Design a protein around this ligand. Structure first.
Ligand SMILES: C=CCn1nc(-c2ccc(O)cc2O)c2cccc(C(F)(F)F)c21
Ligand SMILES: C=CCn1nc(-c2ccc(O)cc2O)c2cccc(C(F)(F)F)c21
Lengths: 237, 9, 228, 9
């Protein structure tokens, strides 16, 4: 059970759960258009989602939930989850976003898609923030798990309590990692807060991205898969 | 729901 | 400087004394059924609350050390989050209801947002959120709103507020494990508050386009900051 | 966006 895992066991489970890094279908034989660029991001998301499901199923506590609650949490969090992964992957590529190894873009390329550059800039800045804080992989996996369990939790009592118990275990794990790294007790609470406040900014970015995706759909820029249509539907634009 | 099916696959 | 030197107790005293009043609405009372008489009521209320909010932000330790530009940016980004956390705090005592004003107690596309706000109030009631914690969270919302020696200054002030939250938790007898857990619980609610503000801001923009409900010049200007 | 600026002053 998730509640009987030690911090070290939680970290090991989450690290082993990590999804693979996928490549985009980038076609370097033609120039980008707004449509073709959006097409790459939605196609990449669509393939990543299948792997996200496999990952979520391995997040301690997630399999205890009903299918409806699992659906709800993923519907809520999917873009946040993609974006935290992006910002993580992009840390050691200052000024660029590593959507995939074959799709490493700077802000002038993001400019190709009308209305995407504000989001692009927020993502770059978030990546820089993680770089400055020297975010560790062990911290990153805790944060991504937090997003999955938290983003949809309030919009569902016993199921909720279980979820809140698992979230508490992840907090414990973060603090453990910080103590392990030699942070003072004060530094531990301060870094915990700094990391969790970044999650508010990731939510912000996801909401702005979701509104942008809805515009792309409603302007017939890109065809969305049936999965992305349903993911988008859940955000009720 | 596609996601509902994917979670079971 | 001076805000980096306040004790936790003095931080708390400062924020408590800065608290704005709870304002009354124009709700008439029933006797008119709702239309967007309701949106009319909420936007009138917000507009009056905003003037108090601006004068409250000046009293948040650290805020007045920022440039006027940065002060403007933070309030433009945070204002609906701040209104909403106030609402949720006022509504703690009224399960299933939102106390927009003492005279305006509404129950349950605004329904999705009402439901989110209700859920947040319920979370705060479940956690027995304290007034001292509430005022710390509201200042965090102001300073964290959303997305660099002055970045360092905001970060130093944010650390001090975090220290103040933990101080309050320690005072209340919580173990270290419990303090860290509660701190995380509270800060994760801010993600949901951000979410609700984002949703709310889209409704406000839609209202602006429809031109039915009157929106103050200040509200129009706040809204405009969220679009460009 | 000048109203807020005036009010902060
Ligand atoms: C820079 C755009 C944000 N974004 N990022 C992604 C994205 C895709 C894959 C991934 O691993 C990470 C992402 O942030 C994305 C996918 C679909 C739609 C959108 C958009 F919000 F613009 F509508 C996406
Ligand atoms: C549930 C409505 C959200 N909301 N709340 C408020 C609101 C007003 C006053 C207050 O003290 C707290 C509020 O959340 C509000 C004001 C203007 C527009 C909106 C909206 F986003 F819904 F369309 C507002």
């Amino acid at each position: 059970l998730a509640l009987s895992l030690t911090a070290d066991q939680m970290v090991s489970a989450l690290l082993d759960a990590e999804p693979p890094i996928l490549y985009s279908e980038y076609d370097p034989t033609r120039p980008f258009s707004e449509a073709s660029m959006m097409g790459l991001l939605t196609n990449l998301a669509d393939r990543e989602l299948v792997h996200m499901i496999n990952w979520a199923k391995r997040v301690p506590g997630f399999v205890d939930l009903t299918l409806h609650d699992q659906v709800h949490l993923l519907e809520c969090a999917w873009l946040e989850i993609l974006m935290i992964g992006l910002v993580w992957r992009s840390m050691e590529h200052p000024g660029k976003l590593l959507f995939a190894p074959n799709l490493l873009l700077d802000r002038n390329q993001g400019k190709c898609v009308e209305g995407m550059v504000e989001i692009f800039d927020m993502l770059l800045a978030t990546s820089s923030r993680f770089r400055m804080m020297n975010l560790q992989g062990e911290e990153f996996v805790c944060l991504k798990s937090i997003i999955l369990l938290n983003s949809g939790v309030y919009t569902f009592l016993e199921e909720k309590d279980h979820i809140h118990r698992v979230l508490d275990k992840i907090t414990d794990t973060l603090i453990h990692l910080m103590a392990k790294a030699g942070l003072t007790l004060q530094q531990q609470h301060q870094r915990l807060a700094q990391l969790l406040l970044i999650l508010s900014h990731i939510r912000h970015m996801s909401n702005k991205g979701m509104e942008h995706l809805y515009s792309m759909k409603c302007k017939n820029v890109v065809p969305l898969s049936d999965l992305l249509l349903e993911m988008l539907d859940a955000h009720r634009l | 729901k596609i996601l509902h099916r994917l979670l079971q696959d």
